[PDB]
Amino acid sequence: SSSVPSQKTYQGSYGFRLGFLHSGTAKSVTCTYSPALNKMFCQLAKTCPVQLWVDSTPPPGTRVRAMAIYKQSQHMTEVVRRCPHHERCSDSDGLAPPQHLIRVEGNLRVEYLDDRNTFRHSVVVPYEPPEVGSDCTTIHYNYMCNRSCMGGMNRRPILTIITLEDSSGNLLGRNSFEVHVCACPGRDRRTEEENLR
Ligand SMILES: [Zn+2]
């Protein structure tokens, strides 16, 4: 058996889009997003801000789900999970399953799912509208393995799929971005952009 979650962009009725801080590539940055590569460069277990931008307010009870998938075609059917080492280092925050790559930081309403049919992991929070004078909603994700992990991702590129779903789980919108968890995001981003013709 196997299945592959859709990664098709779907802005949907509420005009759902993702946004990221314009953080630059100084060596000290804790994370940084490349618009040219649609790629977020971030660090193990550290804050990774992702912004939700909507054009109109979704219904009450809307939820925001994050799920990782392998980028390379030949690995798409493989569930992305933490490496054995990090799983064993028993470092759950008391909410997150130790096998889950993606956590949410700073939200006590976070919910984690092991899908009993597809075996995929995901993390979901209630959708909240922006604060007054803010134009987006920010979620702090943490990625709990990097590209230096042996086993688990094992150096392979991944994407995060962000889904807006209603209270009944129906699809309202979907977006995605590549994630590269590394030691020095600023350096990795600048280097990877240096190639661009
Ligand atoms: Zn790991």
Residue numbers in the entry: 94 to 290
Q: What is the paper's account of this structure, in its own sentences?
A:
The tumor suppressor p53 acts as a DNA sequence-specific transcription factor regulating and activating the expression of a range of target genes in response to genotoxic stress. The majority of tumor-related p53 mutations, particularly those defined as mutational ‘hotspots’, occur within the DNA-binding core domain of p53 (10). R273, a DNA-contact amino acid, is one of the most frequently altered residues in human cancer (6.4% of all somatic mutations), with mutations to histidine (46.6%) and to cysteine (39.1%) being most common.
The crystal structures provide high-resolution information on various R273-related mutants including the oncogenic single mutants: R273H and R273C, the rescued double mutants: R273H/T284R, R273C/T284R, R273H/S240R and R273C/S240R, and their complexes with DNA. Similar geometrical features of the protein surfaces are displayed by the crystal structures of the single mutants: R273H and R273C, and of the double mutants: R273H/S240R, R273H/T284 and R273C/T284R in the absence of DNA. The mutation sites of these proteins are compared with the corresponding region of the wt p53-DNA complex by modeling the central A/T doublet as shown in Supplementary Figure S4, confirming again the inability of His or Cys residues at position 273 to interact with the DNA target. The arginine side chains of the second-site mutations in these structures (T284R and S240R) display a range of conformations in their free state, but a single conformation is observed in their DNA-bound state.
